[PDB]
Amino acid sequence: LRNFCVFSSVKPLDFCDQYSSPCSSDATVDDGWFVCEYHASRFFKMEKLALAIPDGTGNNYYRTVGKSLVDDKAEGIERILIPSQNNYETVLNLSLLGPAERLVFYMIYDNKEKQNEICQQLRMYERFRPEVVEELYNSTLRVLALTNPDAYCAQTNTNESRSFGLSVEDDLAFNVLPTFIQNLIRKCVAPESLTIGTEDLQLRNCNTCRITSEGLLASVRLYNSVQPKYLYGVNENRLQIRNVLQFQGNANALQQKLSRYELYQINIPLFLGKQIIST
Amino acid sequence: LRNFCVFSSVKPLDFCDQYSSPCSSDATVDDGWFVCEYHASRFFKMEKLALAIPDGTGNNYYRTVGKSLVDDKAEGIERILIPSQNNYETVLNLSLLGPAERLVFYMIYDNKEKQNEICQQLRMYERFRPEVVEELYNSTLRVLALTNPDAYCAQTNTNESRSFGLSVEDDLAFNVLPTFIQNLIRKCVAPESLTIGTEDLQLRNCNTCRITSEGLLASVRLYNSVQPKYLYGVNENRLQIRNVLQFQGNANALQQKLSRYELYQINIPLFLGKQIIST
Amino acid sequence: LRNFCVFSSVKPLDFCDQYSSPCSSDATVDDGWFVCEYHASRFFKMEKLALAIPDGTGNNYYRTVGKSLVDDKAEGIERILIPSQNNYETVLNLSLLGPAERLVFYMIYDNKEKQNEICQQLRMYERFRPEVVEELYNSTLRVLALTNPDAYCAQTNTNESRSFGLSVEDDLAFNVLPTFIQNLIRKCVAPESLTIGTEDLQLRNCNTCRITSEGLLASVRLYNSVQPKYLYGVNENRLQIRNVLQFQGNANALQQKLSRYELYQINIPLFLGKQIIST
Amino acid sequence: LRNFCVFSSVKPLDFCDQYSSPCSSDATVDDGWFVCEYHASRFFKMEKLALAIPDGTGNNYYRTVGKSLVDDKAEGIERILIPSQNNYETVLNLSLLGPAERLVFYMIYDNKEKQNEICQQLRMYERFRPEVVEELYNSTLRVLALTNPDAYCAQTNTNESRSFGLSVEDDLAFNVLPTFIQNLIRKCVAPESLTIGTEDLQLRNCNTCRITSEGLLASVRLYNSVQPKYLYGVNENRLQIRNVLQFQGNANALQQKLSRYELYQINIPLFLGKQIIST
């Protein structure tokens, strides 16, 4: 597939796709997220990070992890990274989104009546472009089937096991998430303790997120101040005012002489659960 | 679509497709049957005919109709042109058919466990060709969705109405046929009386087939003796002996002088039901 | 006004207006119909004729009259030239008409909820073209106000009087027609007896139409066989079959020698009512 | 629109428009008042001010606010900035105003009989200039429709909310003001406390006006002494004597040395109500 992004087929009527930041080449490769960096940052409010695991030789067991983009000052529906069926409409703000985005999200969450009424309202557009709708639906449905744990092929790797907490509520809630949402969640949060073969590698002793009935949240108020490089960039006649935290400083307080050491950026990777890798 | 035939993606492991008679270019065009002439003759035992309706000027309202290939001498599961879910396994003889054909037929008739066990037995082949199965399933499923009366698009033309008899049992049985089977049946049998606009054109006063609980049958013993030009043509070490009817004759009995008149071949087109075409 | 046609502002999203036959220059001039020849023929199924009244000198008191386009063989909702509020939706077949046409017709007939839901469904288009809707509504509303007998200016000519029958039901029904419909009806049907000054000119002793509760109809089965020169001309995948009447003939039956006399075409002008012109 | 002023189409019979001070270019732009500075000062006795809201960076959230032109010494119908339907005739002194101004004001306040009798008395002028009246009415009516909260388009922004007091009488009276009057009032008085996003900016702790059953008044006797730069300037054979307050002074009392500091003019901006801006 040249485009593994689910939101790759998101087009207006006369489509020079919105893409203020063009979709990254990550959609071309099969890393398993099935979403490009731009769509991940815009919708799920997370970026992609290459988790490197050294072993003392030079080669690193590379992995994909989610990088939080929400700030510690946030509260409410803004702190949720990935919503569940309960309130995803309000979280993703599907009311004013483009009809292709609405369709894609609704049939990812699989609520029949919503895409039914989308088709009813799209019938008027259908007389101009009667071919894009079917191919868009086919591509998105086949992507969902590929990421679906149960299908015809149903490619299953029981050797990898993911635990999202020692409590019953956490995994019982995680069970009812959509198949694509489950696949994205399992492969965006790094394990707390990667159990590989007959040993355990303690990647992190603290969780940077939480899985609950409404989905994946940045529950901990870890301080984050990274700016998204693939911002929406649309002309904002609708103003969103925010409480920015800024400090002053001189050349002495801004210690440039400390810059020669390799930098340890304050990023917020998603760490939760245990990864059981037999053998 | 370059190939509307459902059995277009029927390939062995090393595929130079069986196709003793290559698939006709009818699969390229959208006549609605979604089966090529070779597959229609081999499986459903029918050919395709261009029903021309003159009106006194020269232009003909062309239509597609089914041409029976069964003989009047036949009895049993051989006289059924299209089977239903009841006995399609025995009618189509799926026991010894190629696995692609088995898969296609089973998921056309939508019996989950059969294609499930096909996948289980195909897992061994999967390690050699892990890409053809998914694309084959996707193409066949999208063809079924396109021929499905209910779907996302669900392109419906209520203006055309098809009646398959004045009895309750006939249409009640026709209702439970598969969606693709229903689409093929509605567009292979010519109407007894084509009701178009405010008038009725009596195409035929007699039915040449029957729709029952087991499907579409050549119930009437109409005499048929046309040979299929797209025969299976496979080396037959398994012998099928049949009771052929042959007559002798001289040059006088074989009246060549009668050949100058345009020929009226004894063919058996499928005629049944009434086509209500408002306006 | 460069364009007096009410349907002059009928545009698709990307508008190269449908107009298989371009709108005639009649919309440029103020003849009072406020509809061009193409829109009159397409919707109201009538054409425009120049009624000339000689007086024995050479100058003719020109007038505008409606020419029927329906055939004598017609019956039902097809024989009505102009519908009323009762069944104009079915008469004009507004279900599949373009949204601009639907809006124009609905606010001509003044049924609030219909153009309200048109606006609700047009909100999606509004984000692309937020300026055409307001100007279209303003132009059509000002045209309706100009043709409205009651307004600010309310230009009234009481000297001209129109009678649409000697029965109470006819004029009582004609009273409840829409203002634009009333203006079009009064100035499309020629008077039976033009009462001008102190004399009466008997234009016709027989009525060629009828005004009833559902509007203006071609009640009489007068034989009409003129073809519209401004036909819709759209690619018709939806077939309308009609019962055409045709006769054969040779050169003798087709008397070309009779052609030298000036022709008296069998046309069906709209004649009904009495025109009282004091002085 | 080149001219958003409602009183832009105010012309005498031979029109070189009165405009002792020509209409400002504010009518060209869409600030929402839909009245130019000259007409606002002449009729509503208020000017326009650019309310700048600094935030500590340099950019200012600009807004439009009304500047009072009445003096503290005034009493009676003179202290009302904007009248309601109760006594607008006496407030605006429509008795001797030009007929275009009378028409515009009356159909802004929507009292049918007044513009009806204006049309009756204007019939005599109509024979000379039968085209200006209709276009003037159309332009003014479309301006009122554009400023009308309810219309076909009915462009509504529920996110902005305006409160005109914590008492029931104030907002209940404000409800019955005309649509254009309501739009002008909502966008001429600055909020007491601009509630934006999740914070509140206290612009002013004291109200400089009042909204009552008769409209918008300068209830507080705040001292105002600014002269209008767009005065009526008409030759006044009808004398209006006023009680002017004047003080004497020398060069010492007129401290020119204090002028180097940036001046804080004693102006009277309209401050009342709370502006709720969600997000």
Residue with tokens 């999606």: C124
Instruction: Give the DSSP H or E segment for C200.
Output: strand C199-201
To the nearest whole Å, the CA of A252 is away from the closest chain D CA by 24
- The answer to whether the CB of A108 falls within 8 A of the CB of A94 is no
Q: Which long-range contacts (CB under 8 A, 24 or more apart) does D23-27 make?
A: D24/D230, D27/D3
How would you classify the pairing of strands C80-83 and C274-277? unpaired
Residues of B in contact with A110 (CB under 8 A): none
Question: What's the token pair of residue D124?
Answer: 């005599």
Inter-chain CB proximity C241 and B279 less than 8 Å: yes
CA A126 to chain CA centroid, nearest Å: 31
Partner-chain contact C128 A13, CB within 8 Å:
yes
Dmax (CA) of chain A: 67
**Closest-CA residue to A175 (of A188, A186, A187):** A186
Q: How far apart are CA C251 and CA D16, in angstroms?
A: 75
Touch criterion met for C and A (3+ Cβ pairs within 8 Å): yes
Q: How far, in Å, CA of C124 to CA of C128, rounded?
A: 8
Determine the 3-state secondary structure of C237 from DSSP. Answer: coil
Specify the amino acid at residue D256. Answer: Q
Interface size B-C, in CB pairs within 8 Å, comes to 12
Q: How far apart are CA D157 and CA D155, in angstroms?
A: 7
Q: Kindly state whether D196 is in contact with chain A, defined as any CB-CB distance less than 8 angstroms.
A: yes
The three-state secondary structure class of D257 is: helix
Round to whole Å and give the CA distance between A53 and A269: 14
Give the pair of three-digit tokens for residue C193. Answer: 């007896």
- Mutation pick from A78, A93, A95, A241 vs chain D, by most beta carbons of D within 10 Å, is A241
Neighbours of A117 (CB within 10 A): 11
Residue C126 with chain D: CB contacts under 8 Å = 153
Give this entry's resolution in angstroms. Answer: 3.4
Sign of dihedral through CA atoms D105, D107, D108, D110? positive
CA D55 to chain centre: 28
- The HSE-up count of residue A45 (CA atoms within 13 Å, CB side) is 20
C6: exposed, middle or buried (Cβ count in 10 Å: 0-12, 13-18, 19+): buried
Torsion sign (Cα): A71, A73, A74, A79: positive
Contact predicate D185/D174, CB 8 Å: yes
Q: Is A248 on the interface with D (CB under 8 A)?
A: no
Q: DSSP letter string over A134-149?
A: HHHHHHHHHHHHHH-S
State the smallest CA–CA distance between residue D103 and chain A in angstroms. 37
Which H or E element spans position C163? strand C160-163
Closest chain C CA to residue B160:
C238
Give dist(CA C276, CA A42) in Å, integer: 73
- Give the three-state DSSP class for A79: coil
CA–CA separation, D45 vs C104, rounded Å? Answer: 42
Strands D193-196, D274-277: pairing kind: parallel
Distance CA(D118)–CA(D133), nearest Å, equals 11
A112/chain C closest Cα distance in angstroms: 21
Beta carbons within 10 angstroms of residue A105's beta carbon: 21
Q: Which residues between 77 and 106 in chain C have a beta carbon less than 8 angstroms from any beta carbon of chain A?
A: 99
Query: Cα-Cα-Cα-Cα dihedral of A135, A140, A141, A145, to 10°?
Result: 140
Experimental method: cryo-EM
Give me D93's structure tokens. 């002194």
Closest CA to A276 of A178, A146, A134, A162: A162
Residue the block writes with tokens 């760490």: A271
Contact: chain A with chain B (3+ CB pairs below 8 Å): yes
As for chain B, the residues directly before each break of C–N over 2.5 Å are: none
When CB atoms are compared, the residue of A115, A146, A154 closest to B152 is A115
Provide CB contacts within 8 A for B191, sequence distance 6+: B162, B203, B271, B272, B273, B274, B275
* Partner-chain contact D153 C119, CB within 8 Å: yes
Chain C touched by A206 (CB under 8 Å): no
In this complex, do B279 and C243 lie within 8 Å of one another by their Cβ atoms?
Answer: no
Angle at which helices C179-186 and C132-147 pack, to 10 degrees?
A: 50
Distances (CA, A) of C140 to C5, C22, C36, C133: 9, 20, 14, 11
A150 interaction partners in chain B (CB closer than 8 Å): none
Residue pair C48/C66 in contact (Cβ under 8 Å)? The answer is yes
First to last CA, chain C: 31
Cα dist from D79 to C33, C74, D172, whole Å = 53, 73, 21
Share of chain D residues as helix, strand and coil, in percent rounded to the nearest 5:
30, 15, 55
Distance, in Å, from the CA atom of B216 to the CA atom of B45, rounded to the nearest integer, reads 11
- Which tokens hold the place of C171? 């004029």
Q: B112-126 and B99-109 helices cross at what angle (nearest 10)?
A: 150
What subunits make at least 3 CB pairs under 8 angstroms with C?
A, B, D
A244 and chain D in contact, CB less than 8 A: no
- Residue D111 buriedness (CB in 10 A; 0-12 / 13-18 / 19+): middle
Q: In whole angstroms, what is the distance from residue B231 CA to residue B40 CA?
A: 11
DSSP assignment letter at D201: E
Would the CB atoms of C124 and A13 count as touching at under 8 Å?
A: no
The terminus-to-terminus CA distance of chain B in angstroms comes to 31
Cα dihedral D197, D202, D205, D208 in deg (nearest 10)? -80
DSSP string computed for C33-70: --S-HHHHHHTS-EEEEEE----SSS----EEEEEE--
